[PDB]
Symmetry: C5
Subunit: 365 residues, 5 copies
């Protein structure tokens, strides 16, 4: 993920123009190889028209250039690109929200599974580790970044996500399908055991764990839906054909013709097609937005940081259910306990800006 | 389903252009018959203008060609196609999410229905089989792929989805409407029995089963909504009329006229309409995106694998509620039980890439 | 509802072109009266220019035709139509999903209200009849198809939806507003009675009934929201003005002028405006998509089958809570009870097509 | 609200053209003042060119007219208007759904708060009155229609929404923010009291009241979100600048030039710009769709009937929880109690239309 | 936030034109520096063509101007801007709804945590303060307005959001990730303590607190998702390149050429490009809509008032759970207790407008 949120906090004079100076996660990185190949074909096709062609063939070349320039219909592609890109951005934001996060699970686990003894801590840690084990097992199937970190199940055991004994019970399961769902069934059996043993003091507390685990498992099942069912291949090929056929019309249709011929609209030579190379940055770059977001789980710079999230989830969920289990500060009276209004102060950079009138509704003038 | 997710994990130089080399699930498979019929009508209409017509009729043919070329309004159709296609892709992704999956049901069933004896395993397996029976019964009504596998109810009994005794109770039900809902009522009676017999130890556990069964049944009821109510026929006919009337204007409006006539914009012969056949790949291919997704339950290559899902659901749901019922590994201390931070390692292909600074928020520079 | 789902299960050579041969629920049925009035005004305006006008008035008529042809701006309307139509299709699919269905209610009622005696069957049937009574009472207010079947409340009593005694309690309620909500309050009093009498054995079972009844009532309340608040009238008048003002520009701007005048672009006579009548099928037909879906509850062929749904709901909900109450087949061992994998067979038309490799994720090459 | 739902139930020959005859809630009411000002500036600018200008100044005026006619780019604005209008219609439909309705609350209150005595009726009525008090207090802040009915809190006490004693407790609350949330806290204290006193017989019944009250309060909190955060002002000013700068190009760019000058495209005089005034109805009317829906809570004809809803909610919620508390008709056997199929009849206008085949799925030919 | 909701309550003659007179939160504030730089480059490029260039170089300059005017393709950018802006407005409205609000939490806390003694008030106030502590801790990471008010954790302790003892337990937590989640774990331990001590009298009351806390925490977790994952940088650079390359074509392509040259479309001088500067207000202003909403948490005038919300939330949540705990007015009979219809009156400005017929449905003529 390339975060530039702090760069556009204000809307100043260099608002969005300053981000064109950025290289990491940018369009120039994604386009410069196709950009030199587009210009290299243009300069070769121009240099042929200046030296190697004859006077008969040049007049034939001139009529071909005016033919292709008519079929450079840039208007239509700007709809197929926009609808398709919006479809790709919609699946990409929804792939991010289906990332297996255990924050909802850990707040239930610390509040409902009980016990300061060695069995109380083991119930809670194993419950959070089973959630995180499924999260590794769904991310190693959809993320090549996660998969290069856990290429085998032995790596998952080495990482401590699975124990050697659990792997014996894992690999002796007879199923030909992906078994990321297996620690979720292990989760429901550990929660059913602790309810029977009274570590879960309540039946409603037990229902909450199974409610929030299925939310977790449906997020893992949603990442399998996106990985299996991509944007349909025909709609990807239809969008790519229209963009690349528009730049075949520009490769011929924008060639600089001989001024001594007196052609309409064709009498000026820039020797470099500046506005065609800028239109190339537009349309090939607009399509490269979809090529970058269609598989957001790789190793490139703007991709999701799945491995960092896995570390953040295992660290926080152990910390919350072991070190933070029933470790509260003593109940003290707050600083506005005996106050009419509870009003926290402002700093000197925020006092002189926030004397504004409080909104009460639009009918109170 | 044609999965090409692994082909676009990186955004390299051959980003989307490599998918134009793909044949299975592609646009060339969907279009090549209409493409040769479009070119065959163009070559016949051109060859008439070169040999069989007279000099009087050719001048009449020339004015007809410039007439039709004015009415080739490609701009407008690129809106009717985009809005209609987005409408078809929206119904198609939502048809996929309404697929009857039993993963939420099996995690509740293994955690709440109890008993290692022969009656405990029968309660749980019959509960998951009733869910899967409705799933076969809704998919044989909407999927010709599923229906060719289960053409009769005898096939469903042969497949073991229904028992002979249940079919007696099934076929003696007096109803003229589709009875896919029937094992869901059978489900609520089996769950009410096991709550009365104490296999379901809790009232909140009983409510969770009925909560998650109605989620399952509403997904089956959603697949009946899409099968009954398609994209409206008038809006399908309006989109198809505009695309096919645009290519009647191209069939005449793009004919290669006699250069010795000196017509404006009509003096060059390619003998094959290259940019009109590429525009045909655009607009007939953009419409063929909607024709492929309007009924995603058939046997074609990019359709949903409904039969594979039925096998995956019956196998996993038996495995989870029979072999995995109360079969836990022993509670062991984890590898980070006595660690301050729980930090799993990286492989050598992921260590040198993930030394990046951790995000703390955009206000912490 | 005109269902053509089975016609487009494959994407073959006659993909969408075969639906242009369809008459019921089609665009030709919705347009042919306006189409002959458009052509009849064109043929009258042409025949005036050929016989009744003089040579002075024809030259004045010619300049008016080139004036209107400039203002035939077909591009802009293709946005106002697409956004407005998408807005109408969005409300129309959401009007369908708010149809009062009792499937969620009947699965709770058979699982929670108990008793094989005469009082047990009466509790359950009256609970499902009160849900269906509200459903008739909301559909007779929004559907002229349902209203022509139940023009009075006497018809609802005759249909058995309301008893004569309930109508006494119904019509003596002092309220000036629509009372479709009244059997929902009758529902919550019947469920509160059976919980007090112990027919509902559980407090969590009681909460589930009131949870799923408010879902039902909110769907009935959603159909009152759409019936009261249509697409806003100004946005309907703005879209209709733009389409009809475009075809006033075509009625004059596409007239066939005298070839002996030598006008640019105006020298060819087809005597029938083929591409203008096809553009009329486009734009008047695209607007007729919205006119057909703006009130989907009538009697026309593509409208929702509300009356059929009412019969389907009353039949299934009586069958589920009376004949299917606690009528289970005996718990038998299934055909894969002693199997490692539970694998149902394929037919001969599905065996040779589904030997495909199972998807495990996109990172497992 | 101007309801025209009954006018478009069929799609007949005068489908949408009949709504152009409508005046109340229409575009002609919203535009006719700006329309005469547009035409009055056009007729003044034309009459200057015919009489007061000289022959030198007219030739200067002619070149200015052809300059502005080039910059009348109607295409681009039709995107800024469509996206912005769709954004305004999306917020407007969601402002309607956040209207404080008590139907979900009253069905829970009649089913869970108990008691036929004077204290039982007071618990239930005060619970529904506290919900309705917040609904008045949120609507008087966002609706000038509601605010002109309740300009002070004394008016709310006079209306009986608040008692004099509650207003003492209301106005002695020390808070500078809008206190519409205050009867919702009063609600949770009344429900907690009746659970302690046993009027609420169940803990699950108590949780349902607090569940459905927060749904009610979040709808009131959503109406404060829309009232505070409108469509952003810069995006409103960008859309308005583009529409009004297009009609400055039409005010000059469509002037009728002297025919004796022989200008291209400028030789015909209609003395009234018919197609420019129709384009004005298009673009100023399309923008007036957003100006009418951006604040839907006023007193104009197509605005929401908030005051009528407040009366409908207070009347129905008293009727349901006082007159309809435990007032059921006796449990009778229904008319299809001893029937195999329960089939209600059709009237003569619905019998001959609904002999259609029942849908069983698209795979059953 | 610049609220102009009260200015557009009616749709009068100065409907949206009056908002072009507004300065605070407007487009003129966001654009006037780029607008003078665009005009300053235009006036310098014009003044070079009038004085410093020679007659040879001016003829070369003239052909460059007609070259760039062809590539001023304003149509295509109006799609890339609309789709991208709609994407930015969609994330911006969803960033607002994820603001940490404690209204749902405080209604549960006052209804479920019990006790008038000093320990009862401390349980409730500390529960609402822990929710508000996370809300400060998530807003200081994403809002530079909130962060300038709380630059350190000492400021949070000084503000009374954290106690000195809690900060000891806060800063000794071993985690490298942002710890805004920490008082949510503190919340679940305080609620689990009060359930064990019987201040929470019910198990269902305990489940409701943990249900509504995870809703609160997921809103805080959603604000971290938007802050980390912005609009992708390539799609921001593609939109900015297209807008700025269009105005490089206008900077040259709209220059006023010498009239004595007789160029087509280039013979008129306004000495100020009025319609190009208005198109600049359109396209640079349409892009400045996205630059203002892409980071809505700053200090600019139309940004969200996060600091005001923090004060509003801490004040209301203390008031509701301390001063308003079990402080009800006595149960009185209401003003319509003995009335058939409960009908509140109208004022004189609302009586003469609301005699309209009550809607009963669209089928009741
Ligand atoms: Cl619950």
């Amino acid at each position: 993920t390339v975060t530039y949120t702090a760069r556009v906090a204000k809307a100043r004079f260099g608002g969005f123009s300053k981000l064109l100076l950025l290289w990491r996660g940018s369009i120039y990185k994604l386009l410069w190889r196709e950009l030199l190949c587009f210009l290299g074909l243009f300069m070769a096709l121009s240099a042929a028209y200046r030296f190697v062609l004859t006077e008969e063939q040049k007049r034939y070349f001139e009529k071909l250039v005016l033919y292709c320039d008519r079929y450079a219909s840039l208007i239509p592609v700007s709809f197929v690109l926009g609808f398709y890109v919006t479809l790709v951005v919609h699946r990409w934001w929804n792939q991010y929200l289906s990332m297996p996060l255990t924050d909802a699970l850990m707040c239930v686990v610390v509040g409902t599974v009980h016990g300061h003894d060695e069995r109380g801590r083991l119930y809670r840690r194993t419950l959070m580790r089973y959630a995180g084990l499924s999260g590794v097992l769904i991310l190693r199937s959809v993320s090549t970044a996660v998969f290069k970190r856990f290429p085998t199940i032995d790596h998952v055991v080495e990482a401590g996500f699975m124990t050697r004994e659990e792997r014996k019970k894992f690999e002796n399961l007879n199923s030909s399908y992906n078994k990321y769902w297996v620690p979720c069934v292990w989760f429901c059996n550990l929660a059913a055991q602790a309810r029977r043993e009274g570590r879960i003091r309540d039946n409603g507390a037990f229902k909450l764990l199974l409610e929030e685990l299925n939310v977790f498992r449906s997020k893992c099942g949603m990442l399998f839906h996106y990985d299996w069912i991509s944007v349909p291949l025909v709609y990807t090929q239809v969008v790519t054909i229209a963009v690349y056929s528009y730049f075949l019309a520009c490769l011929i249709g924008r060639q600089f013709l001989d001024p001594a011929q007196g052609y309409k609209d064709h009498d000026l030579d820039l020797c470099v097609p500046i506005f065609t190379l800028l239109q190339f940055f537009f349309y090939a770059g607009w399509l490269k937005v979809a090529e970058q977001l269609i598989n957001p789980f790789g190793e490139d710079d703007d991709d999701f940081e799945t491995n960092f999230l896995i570390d953040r989830c295992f660290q926080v969920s152990m910390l919350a259910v072991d070190e933070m289990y029933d470790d509260l500060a003593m109940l003290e009276k707050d600083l506005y306990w005996d106050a009419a209004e509870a009003r926290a102060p402002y700093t000197a950079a925020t006092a002189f800006l926030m004397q504004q009138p409080s909104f009460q509704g639009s009918t109170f003038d």
